[PDB]
Amino acid sequence: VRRLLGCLGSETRRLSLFLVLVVLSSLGEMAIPFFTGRRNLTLMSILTIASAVLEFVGDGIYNNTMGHVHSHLQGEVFGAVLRQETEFFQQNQTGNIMSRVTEDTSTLSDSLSENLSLFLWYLVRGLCLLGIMLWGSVSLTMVTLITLPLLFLLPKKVGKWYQLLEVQVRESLAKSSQVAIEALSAMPTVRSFANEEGEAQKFREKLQEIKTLNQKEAVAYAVNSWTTSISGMLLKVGILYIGGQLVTSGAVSSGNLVTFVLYQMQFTQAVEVLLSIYPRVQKAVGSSEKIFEYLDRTPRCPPSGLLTPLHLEGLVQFQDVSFAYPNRPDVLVLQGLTFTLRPGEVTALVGPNGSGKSTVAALLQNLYQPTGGQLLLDGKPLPQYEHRYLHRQVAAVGQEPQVFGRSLQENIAYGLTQKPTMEEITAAAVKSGAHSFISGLPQGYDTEVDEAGSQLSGGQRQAVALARALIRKPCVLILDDATSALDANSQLQVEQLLYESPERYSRSVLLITQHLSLVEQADHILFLEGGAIREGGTHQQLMEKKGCYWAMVQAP
Amino acid sequence: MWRLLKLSRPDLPLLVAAFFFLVLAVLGETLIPHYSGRVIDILGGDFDPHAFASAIFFMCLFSFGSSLSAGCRGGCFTYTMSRINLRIREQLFSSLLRQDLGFFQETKTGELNSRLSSDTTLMSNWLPLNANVLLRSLVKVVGLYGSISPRLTLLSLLHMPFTIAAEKVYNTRHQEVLREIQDAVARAGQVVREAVGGLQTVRSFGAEEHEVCRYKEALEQCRQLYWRRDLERALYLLVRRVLHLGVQMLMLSCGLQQMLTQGSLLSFMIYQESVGSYVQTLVYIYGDMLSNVGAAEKVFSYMDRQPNLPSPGTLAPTTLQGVVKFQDVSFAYPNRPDRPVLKGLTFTLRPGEVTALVGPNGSGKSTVAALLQNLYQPTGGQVLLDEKPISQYEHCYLHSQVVSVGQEPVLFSGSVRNNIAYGLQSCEDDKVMAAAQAAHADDFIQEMEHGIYTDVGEKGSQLAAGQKQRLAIARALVRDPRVLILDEATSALDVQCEQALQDWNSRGDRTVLVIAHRLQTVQRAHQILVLQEGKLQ
């Protein structure tokens, strides 16, 4: 329960001020008939307008503080999610993560805000009502403070039941969200197969799983509401039974037990409401179980280094690199990789489907850590470089490039520290060949591209991706199946970029493609099959050495 | 308006129990102070076995009567709105799947999931904390209006105009700020979806700090709207109480018309001061429900949005020849009109031969394939399948006979068998293994654990690009279609596999339309169509 108090510690100054106003309002509402002032009587007018100002002031501070707490908590959860490793984002889908961040944080904050106000109101009300109990009748205040802990036994035992039902409900809410977003993201494919009823049945399966638990949270509340109001009746009646005996057998204080009766009933009323909070506290613990697991989870990735050299060259060395995917170990995707990249030289990686060419590209971008030998960049390992500096020097395209839903000038310049200059954007688009069709758009670079690039053609989404990677002046360039469906002007621009550009000596390029025209001109060709390098050398040497590469090129 | 009444209508049997458990609940709690006064006033002198014990016994039964019926109220209220919220969410999602393909272009996926999640809870959590207050307040004002009243009700005349214009201007302001709160939440939810779904692009550039900062700006805009909503409500409550003091003093200003005595006037002053500040709860709570229901009209507009699709088909032949004819088709996309994409295409497809459609990027080849699958309606001319319009065929019949493979396929999360047999109500493993052999997908299937029942991540994230394409070809081939459309099918595959799969017409009774980027890709097609800038040569 103490884990929930971590998020409230940032606003202890404002909460303490609200606590002082709570005490003043509670004291004034109790010692009000004690004075009664001892145009005939404007006493009620000044009393009400004073009790309304303090109510408005106290509500303003509490609402502002609760707004600041909720906004701060949601930001910290999303920050801790994005800090985790790449394998974490594969075990949990995007539907689950959105539900934990957006739904669970709002549910926990709403439950905490509505309960903290009336808990502090009735704690100081019960404490101030108890202070007027010790002097009204001393002998009857000890019997009601030893029977009071007997009522806490049942909520303590059944408290675990509430949070066990809550973790299953939040799990079912997240699973239904994942079904909805996955269907809506791929609507043209769903309609093309006429599978609207299949998605409806999948959504209805999750909703009926919610219903079989939400009945159990309705019977539980009805049972709890009985036992939290019968114990209150047993406390208030049992005082009268002992009180009746003291009148006729004990002292002659029957005129003093009269003032105890009214205060006992109001004290009982404060206890029952204060006892109706504990099931809601355990409900809030169950709702926030998952997001509190994300917050303190240590990522299984090495931390960012501190080295940031001014002058760097693209000398990448592989030294017996073997990698197996973390979600399925002991199946070596790579085996004994050993090759070097040098500046000004283009290396072409070719092979059948499923060889592991895209796995090598993922390793070179520090997405995964190899389980074998070292992977050195300029003589130093990849985790020793700063996070924002390593990904500036090393840039890639990807097999299926992704474009975000904003303007193209904000898409080519994505990720850049600072904000690149406009001419820069046009310079990269001209170099990548995308400037031919950008100028054909009515608004130019201001055309907000829709989600998943629906308004963009086939080869256009790879021309923007090529321009995005080239705008940061990378030291190592990776082309992952980008030059397969490019236009004639873009293909000529790629050939000039790879083999005829003046800045060719500045960077080292790793080329992964099936286009034999670009492969035949590469300085080094590596054949990858089964996770190991089969043959290596130039295009002429591979033809002369005969074998695997010869059979692939001579298939047509 | 009246939609929520019909919506919760199949919950009336549980509802009518709630007002049943409420009437005898408030009845019990109003009579408890009477028997409480019965016990206390006899502590000056009491008899041990006499009605003092009966007073305690009578008081405890009415504690039993009120508390038991109160627990059943909350249990009925807590369950019945789980039923309302889950029914709203199902009707919204079912009606969201019938919309046209252009509707999903205008709205983002994160925004749609936000209203499906956040807005349905708001539209169901309105009365719970207040319907107990509403009818209890209705009971008390009924009970209290049964003393000295020569002109007591005069106060009844002054209690009708509670500055209704001030209530109307507050109601407009409250529904206004509740609308911007929902919009700002939806904008923040889209930020989370964009950053999390495309993580590999975000991590590749080291731009995690940008996505965190964008969410922090979105959270601050929501927070300023939350504080504004709370501020005007607290400002309105303070203003309302000041007027309650004003009308109370003004009514008592005429309190000396006869000075019936002083004691009679002061007897009802406490109860009058009560209902003066207790009838304001009625106008506040009723105004809240009216504004809160109308503050979630974006959900109700989605549930009753009529798509611009044509009338549903009813034709279903038992034997389809497979002839496709385009007759002067002119098409322009509905979200971006006044710019034609296709202009006067005219060709015919025959089942015995293979037709190749070639052209540069941005020419409209995939628009032809999308129009052929009845995904869009041409703005001029028509497309005919077997001498009939393609929109007259049944939705579940046409898409089972005419299948296609997209440029980049998307595979839903689940087993490989579920992806291969997607869209089919039943498919034996004999058919699935037969189709996997045709697409040469059985080579890598055996390497995985559990065989064909292994998991595949979202959008096929746990597969290679070449292996994803082979599953898409096997998915289309398992339906046994009559017209097959191949839109850049053999690109991601290697040289060896794409040469093996080049005939596509071994049976010879299927219409095959192969779409290629270059003319050199296709060499065995009987009819070759060259499509330039959206106009056939």
Ligand SMILES: Nc1ncnc2c1ncn2[C@@H]1O[C@H](COP(=O)(O)OP(=O)(O)OP(=O)(O)O)[C@@H](O)[C@H]1O
């Ligand atoms: N996320 C993943 N989890 C588990 N296995 C994976 C994952 N991604 C790929 N694999 C497996 O790794 C092997 C090769 O994957 P990879 O994507 O690197 O292939 P590739 O040769 O680069 O592909 P292609 O040339 O077809 O695009 C295959 O057996 C594939 O199933």
Ligand SMILES: Nc1ncnc2c1ncn2[C@@H]1O[C@H](COP(=O)(O)OP(=O)(O)O)[C@@H](O)[C@H]1O
């Ligand atoms: N959602 C959309 N809104 C507006 N125009 C679209 C949309 N989707 C596609 N288009 C237009 O249709 C064409 C898509 O077909 P196209 O890209 O030519 O396929 P291919 O290039 O493979 O032949 C593009 O020219 C594009 O302008």
Ligand SMILES: [Mg+2]
């Ligand atoms: Mg790949």
Ligand SMILES: [Mg+2]
């Ligand atoms: Mg196309």
